[PDB]
């Protein structure tokens, strides 16, 4: 006997409730838009009507990304995941962005599906308060069988979000194995690991956690595909990606890029003892060929009414593509980063009363903080809604005084694990940096010139290790985020500045028409 | 028996009627201001009271440079040169900026001193109208002797000014020699060549024109000094500069920088036959240690009242020194050039579909005529801007082949080192020169902002591609020897008035801070 299971999966949807452009920015030309929950619902139902055994799983980071989340604060997540009848969700790092209070009340209490993480352990007064609102696993009836779904969440959540001091994030593999072993003693012979630690950790789970049949992941925005890919995303490997486990088995690993653009689809043939005989599938592109379900669409447009205040006023105009995509902004100089750094610098010089920062000419900005492009076609209008998707996190652009030695180490940290699509890669203003990636980690910065301070005419001069420099940067970086521990520990002064989104909108309003270029601020030799 | 003559001389005063800052920009801090006609008058009288034989000579380019000339149109030049009792002036190129009618009516008819040029010949109806209003020479009584003063004016005047089609500008050496020979047959044994063609031409006149005892020049802003110089100007050689003529004699050549900052002072010992036995002197720095003459200052203040409308409104603020000096803007990237090119680009995007993505700018360095100072709250008025951009040109739009553009960048540095105005300031262009290479093949790198691209980046210029550039009408019309532009351009549209563009930009930006960014570089070998 064989038993067939269809796994449908989303990850890193990031508040893209409505359909979007091809690059996940706002939908303008409806005929070429993609994703959104209403389209997803249609494709899910087509599969459900065709296959008997279907699970619809989310691998986390539903929270944060557009004005949907700014206004509704996770209540939209509960509502539309409930309407889609998700079977389970794993907690991502962004689910803790509004604290544990912003997780509990909006999402955990209102979800009609189990929410999972086996490596998150509650301590003190929070333990009884959150008890049973999330679970380490759920065992789900699927026709005549059961399927065990075990959850996990990135160990980096305390450095990326606001989980608070009364949660502990354990190692995934140490936390998962006892739960998986327990499930076997409970006669659960089919086990899916569902979680939010990235493709590299997903592969290690597949390899090391004995009993895991399939891994459904998130957090790295990993596109996997078998065959000719249907859009711009370049596959990192085949779908499914096959890990050869230490216990001698083939464990498929899946992810479905991000932003609800694709629906993950994996058909698994199990034997009677719960072992994978075979699996096949591919992410399904949610393009115009799949219609938006009318009922969901009507419900989305009902919730949309409150959001239209944010798209009323044109702040200004771009005449160039504002490339705020992760493929650009985490690997090389991107023009959206240049815009944000120039706005940071420009708006700080408005504050003429405060003398200590009134010539600040230097800027750093983590590429992973840039969260959407903006499109120039159809008259390139920029509203608050457009900006909210670029800069969703509600942080500030703060002022720090740093030694040149601290800054050189930050630029080394910027490319220490380069190639892995990590957020710590720095966009800059008033700095020209040259990297040589063939050199060893910690010695890749071959040139670092900065705008002078004690000079009448600003020019780019070599950074001196013993000099001191005034930089404008996100509070996330000032507070030691993205492993920038040298900044937090070595900084000499640190002042709070203005709110990030307000800074960029003011700049755009003043400039009216923007046209930021890639200029050679970051080069590679 | 020896006979001693003191030559006092100014050149390229360029409408600096009032005292100025050290760099010839507007006077703000009075205790460190310099020049102006009232201070000059004080120093002239001190010399005149002490030496019996004194001539005060001007070597041209009184016309053009500040709102004095905008408002009074040369009437200020006549009035204050008359008050100083100049003995003679040679016509410079800028004396023709308002046409021959702008020379005749304001200056030639109202000057109480001879105005000189021996290589300017009037033809047709103009000949009888201008007859005797300027002269090729004047023979001046000085004590019990006479001194011949023979005039000359740059051959380049028709390509730099508006002399009109009824003047011919002859070769200096060919035009001077017959007049100098004539003067000898009239028993004038002491001859000064006074003129406006530049230090290199001045040297050739000294060398080749037999009978010339001394050359007093202008037009190259050449600082000559013997000993330790008193201010920021680097001497190009000794004062006087000694030429060995073809007939073996030692001919002193003098110039006195520009802007009325210095008074040229040369003592000459003549024998009874009019040979130069010896000479010595130096330019005298007209700093605060010489008081402004009270009567001239009172008169200046009377004429000043009309001008104060131009200094009423603050257009905006700079927080950096705006280096618009010739020593910067004709030799390397200057930040005033970057400001003007960015203003040109920015203002054009306000408007017309064919030019609405123009990202490339070229600007002749010699068109930038003053710095602006950042100290004392760095205020920018119209008066400040009028000294930067005095010429009343427009910022025009051209379509050009890449081959035309590469040839322009070769012409930009073909005779580099001579302080010539054709050196180009740029926007949306990164140019690298190797000066060790031969003239016409110094451009080793030339990258430009792309047009048919979503994200603007700097890509190598293609010889066969076509490019859209914003530039002065002076360069569009083939000025500064940019003959390739006029002859090869594919379209040419008139744009906005130059000063209005820069003031609008400053008003929009409020606070400006242009840097030297690496738009123009020089390579090692
Ligand atoms: O799955 P995640 O966690 O979202 C993903 C993991 O690699 C993949 O995101 C792909 C993607 N999605 N959309 N665009 N890019 O990126 C995370 C990256 O985001 C940046 N970051 N993380 C947090 C954060 C922040 N503060 C928060 C603290 C409390 C709440 C707000 N402020 C800023 Cl300016 N930047 C921040 C970092 O550079 C980080 O490395
Ligand atoms: O003694 P001159 O002639 O002024 C001096 C000779 O080398 C030395 O000037 C040192 C100095 N003085 N103050 N600052 N720099 O520079 C002349 C340089 O000036 C620029 N130029 N010349 C004319 C001109 C123009 N049109 C005119 C037509 C009617 C009147 C206006 N438009 C423009 Cl944008 N630029 C123009 C060129 O680059 C030229 O090469
Ligand atoms: C929506 O996506 C599908 C999936 O990629 C596209 O369908 C493909 O179309 C091309 C021809 O244009 C064929 O070579 C493929 O075989 C099709 N794949 C299928 C049906 O799975 C479709 O073109 C997209 N819709 C658009 C562009 O409107
Ligand atoms: C005005 O310029 C003169 C130079 O002509 C300055 O006088 C010189 O001052 C230094 C000391 O500061 C002496 O070593 C020189 O011997 C002086 N030279 C002459 C010719 O007097 C004078 O300081 C300047 N005035 C200022 C700065 O107000
Ligand atoms: Ca199994
Ligand atoms: Ca003689
Ligand atoms: Zn995510
Ligand atoms: Zn994540
Ligand atoms: Zn001049
Ligand atoms: Zn001149």
UniProtKB/Swiss-Prot annotation, chain A:
Cellular component GO terms, alphabetical: cell surface; cytosol; external side of plasma membrane; extracellular exosome; membrane; nucleoplasm; plasma membrane
Regulation: Inhibited by adenosine 5'-(alpha,beta-methylene)-diphosphate (AMPCP).
Residue sites binding Zn(2+) 1 per the record: 12, 14, 61
GO biological process: adenosine biosynthetic process; ADP catabolic process; AMP catabolic process; ATP metabolic process; calcium ion homeostasis; DNA metabolic process; inhibition of non-skeletal tissue mineralization; leukocyte cell-cell adhesion
Complex and partners: Homodimer.
Disease linkage: Calcification of joints and arteries: A condition characterized by adult-onset calcification of the lower extremity arteries, including the iliac, femoral and tibial arteries, and hand and foot capsule joints. Age of onset has been reported as early as the second decade of life, usually involving intense joint pain or calcification in the hands.
Name used for this protein in its record: 5'-nucleotidase
UniProt source species: Homo sapiens
Gene name for this UniProt entry: NT5E
């Amino acid at each position: 006997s064989m038993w067939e299971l269809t796994i449908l999966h989303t990850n890193d949807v990031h508040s893209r409730l409505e359909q979007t452009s091809e690059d996940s920015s706002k939908c303008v030309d409806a005929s070429r838009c993609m994703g959104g929950v209403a389209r997803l619902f249609t494709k899910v139902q087509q599969i459900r009507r065709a296959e008997p055994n279907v699970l619809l799983l989310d691998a986390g980071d539903q929270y944060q990304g557009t004005i949907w989340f700014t206004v509704y604060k996770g209540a939209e997540v509960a509502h539309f995941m409930n309407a889609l009848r998700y079977d389970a969700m794993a907690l991502g790092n962004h689910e803790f962005d509004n604290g544990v209070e912003g997780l509990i009340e909006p999402l955990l209490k209102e979800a009609k599906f189990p929410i999972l993480s086996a490596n998150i352990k509650a301590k003190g007064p929070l333990a009884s308060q959150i008890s049973g609102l999330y679970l380490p696993y759920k065992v789900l009836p699927v026709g005549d069988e059961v399927v065990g779904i075990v959850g996990y969440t990135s160990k980096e959540t305390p450095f990326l979000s606001n989980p608070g001091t009364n949660l502990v994030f354990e190692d995934e593999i140490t936390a998962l194995q006892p739960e998986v072993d327990k499930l076997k003693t409970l006669n659960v012979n089919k086990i899916i690991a569902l979680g939010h630690s990235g493709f590299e950790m997903d592969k290690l789970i597949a390899q090391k956690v004995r009993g895991v049949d399939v891994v459904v992941g998130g957090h790295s925005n990993t596109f996997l595909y078998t065959g000719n890919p249907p859009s711009k995303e370049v596959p990192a490997g085949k779908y499914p990606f096959i890990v050869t486990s230490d216990d001698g088995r083939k464990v498929p690993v899946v992810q479905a890029y991000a932003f609800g653009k694709y629906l993950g689809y994996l058909k698994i043939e199990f034997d009677e003892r719960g072992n994978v005989i075979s699996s096949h599938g591919n992410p399904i592109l949610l393009n115009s060929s799949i219609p938006e379900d009318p009922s969901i669409k009507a419900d989305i447009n009902k919730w949309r009414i409150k959001l239209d205040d944010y798209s009323t006023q044109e702040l200004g105009k771009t005449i160039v593509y504002l490339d705020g995509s992760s493929q650009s902004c985490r690997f090389r100089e991107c023009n959206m980063g240049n815009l944000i750094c120039d706005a940071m610098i420009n708006n700080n010089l408005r504050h003429t009363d405060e003398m200590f920062w009134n010539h600040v000419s230097m800027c750093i900005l983590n590429g992973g903080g840039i969260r959407s492009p903006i499109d120039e076609r159809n008259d390139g209008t920029i509203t608050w809604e457009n900006l909210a998707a670029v800069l969703p996190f509600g942080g500030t652009f703060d002022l720090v005084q740093l030694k040149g030695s601290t800054l050189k180490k930050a630029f080394e940290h910027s490319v220490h694990r380069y190639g892995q699509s990590t957020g710590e890669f720095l966009q800059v203003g008033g700095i020209h940096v040259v990297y040589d990636l063939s050199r060893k980690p910690g010695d890749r910065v071959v040139k670092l010139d900065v705008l002078c301070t004690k000079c009448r005419v600003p020019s780019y001069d070599p950074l001196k290790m013993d000099e001191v420099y005034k930089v404008i940067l996100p509070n996330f970086l000032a507070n030691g985020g993205d492993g920038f521990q040298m900044i937090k520990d070595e900084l000499l002064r640190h002042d709070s500045g203005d709110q990030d989104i307000n800074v960029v909108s003011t700049y755009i309003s003043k400039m009216k028409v923007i046209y930021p270029a890639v200029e050679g601020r970051i080069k590679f030799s």
